[PDB]
């Protein structure tokens, strides 16, 4: 697997955006691509060993990049334009190709450039216990997790049962909901469900925790406002089984 970091980036208009990438172990050719909202890839640059092969015209967007010798690959936009808010993909290939045959892609870096960072808000997290009517009707119990009022839409929601992360019975909304759809930068809401068995819920020794990882502002950033600095943080809500 090829590694891209940070997964999410939030930056102010004009601030620089550094993004790193680790190609697989003996892969010299590296590719940068810009994925837009319309699921469209746009080539940006490719480096073979330490040297750039081809790069796009910099008239519309100016950026730096480097793939040093035993140092991870990097892409750097120095002046943040809201026009460069996108998912940036890094790809590596053995050099051979085939053309794309040996092109292995990273998970991306979703960069969001804002004119006003005072819009950045962390989520509020709540857990809603299953319905007694649901348990009596079907012998299943569904827990709902609500991450509300966050901005931008850079979150990772996860469930934890008795301190262990769980995947069975989990469903997370593929995309967030704009709290105010008619606004331009309304804050976001995300819901998730974890369906367990009624007996598993009914055991009060069982602990359920919903974890929300928010991607925000770095410590090395300017905050003077009234409210607490919307930093990258983990916000959680919990519940115990009920007999």
């Amino acid at each position: 697997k090829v590694i891209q970091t940070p997964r999410y980036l939030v930056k102010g208009q004009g601030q620089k955006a550094k993004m790193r990438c680790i190609p697989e172990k003996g892969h010299p050719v590296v590719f940068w691509y810009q994925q837009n909202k319309n699921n469209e890839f746009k080539f940006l640059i490719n480096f073979q060993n330490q040297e750039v092969l081809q790069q796009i015209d910099m008239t519309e967007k100016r950026f730096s990049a480097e793939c040093p010798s035993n140092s991870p690959c990097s892409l750097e936009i120095q002046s943040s334009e809201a026009g460069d808010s996108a998912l940036y993909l890094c790809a590596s290939s053995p050099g051979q190709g085939a053309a794309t045959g040996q092109l292995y892609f990273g998970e991306g870096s979703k960069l969001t450039v804002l004119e006003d960072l005072r819009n950045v808000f962390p989520p509020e997290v709540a857990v809603f216990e299953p319905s007694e009517a649901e348990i009596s009707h079907t012998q299943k119990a569904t827990l709902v997790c609500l991450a509300t009022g966050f901005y931008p839409d850079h979150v990772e929601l996860s469930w934890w049962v008795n301190g262990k992360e769980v995947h069975s019975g989990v469903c997370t909304d593929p995309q967030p909901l704009k709290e105010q759809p008619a606004l331009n930068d309304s804050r976001y809401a995300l819901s998730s469900r974890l369906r367990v068995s009624a007996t598993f819920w009914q055991n009060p020794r069982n602990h359920f925790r919903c974890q929300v990882q928010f991607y925000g502002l770095s410590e090395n950033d300017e905050w003077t406002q009234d409210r607490a600095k919307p930093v990258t943080q983990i916000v959680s809500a919990e519940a115990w089984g009920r007999a």
């Binding site: 697997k1 050719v29 319309n38 699921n39 469209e40 890839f41 490719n46 073979q48 092969l53 081809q54 993909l89 290939s93 190709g97 085939a98 053309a99 794309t100 045959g101 092109l103 292995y104 892609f105 990273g106 998970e107 991306g108 709540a126 857990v127 809603f128 216990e129 299953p130 319905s131 009517a133 649901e134 009707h137 079907t138 569904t142 709902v144 609500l146 995947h167 069975s168 019975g169 989990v170 469903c171 997370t172 909304d173 593929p174 909901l177 709290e179 105010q180 759809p181 008619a182 809401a189 819901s191 469900r193 369906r195 809500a237 919990e238 519940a239």
Partner: protein, 206 residues
């Protein structure tokens, strides 16, 4: 020098046959290298299949595509579609030039494969908060895949779109949507009424 593919989105029933069209225009070289990439939900782009020899075919995950020189096409096909096949599919063209590879992608087709819910019991439930009481949440669950959950019209009510949950112990699949509000006189028995809900939907008293 490009790639064209079905616009979509393509919504289809579980076990149904599937064709995703792809036509290519290769002005640079006669016969380029052919690819299908797949982006699974919340995962990274990956090679589905390839054909690096014109006239031949490629296979993977029950999908097959034939590099057809005469029709200039690389149609993706699968006879029985499964729920985990729901992803974004990209037809791509690989041509090498200047000694460096080059890769041109299509716009991408979004495939949504609706599971068949064998024994649906549509129900709307009221869930209470584990700690505080600020609002209440409603859950519409166990409805069939043909049912669509319509978005809120009142700006004080939040209604999510349906999502498919799968319990890994038995092959139990279920659709669900969440609705909430702080706006007074908001009932779970009216929450989802702007949708076309099954006439048999169970509305218990909380």
């Amino acid at each position: 020098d490009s790639v064209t593919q079905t616009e979509g989105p393509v919504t289809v029933s579980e076990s149904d046959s599937l064709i995703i069209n792809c036509t290519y225009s290769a002005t640079s070289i006669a016969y380029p290298n052919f690819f299908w990439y797949v982006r699974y939900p919340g995962e990274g782009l990956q090679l589905l299949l390839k054909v690096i020899t014109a006239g031949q075919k490629g296979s993977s995950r029950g999908f097959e595509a034939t590099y057809n020189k005469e029709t200039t096409s690389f149609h993706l096909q699968k006879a029985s579609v499964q729920e985990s096949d729901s992803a974004v599919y990209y037809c791509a063209l690989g041509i090498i030039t200047g000694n460096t590879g080059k890769l041109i992608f299509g716009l991408g087709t979004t495939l949504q494969v609706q599971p068949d819910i064998q024994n649906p019991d549509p129900a709307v439930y009221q869930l209470r908060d584990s700690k505080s009481s600020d609002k209440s949440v409603c859950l519409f669950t166990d409805f069939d895949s043909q049912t669509n959950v319509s978005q809120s019209k009142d700006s004080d009510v939040y209604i999510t779109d349906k999502c498919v949950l799968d319990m890994r112990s038995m092959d139990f699949k279920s659709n669900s949507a969440v609705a909430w509000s702080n706006k007074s006189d908001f009932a779970c028995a009216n929450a989802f009424n702007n949708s076309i809900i099954p006439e048999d939907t169970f509305f218990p008293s909380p």
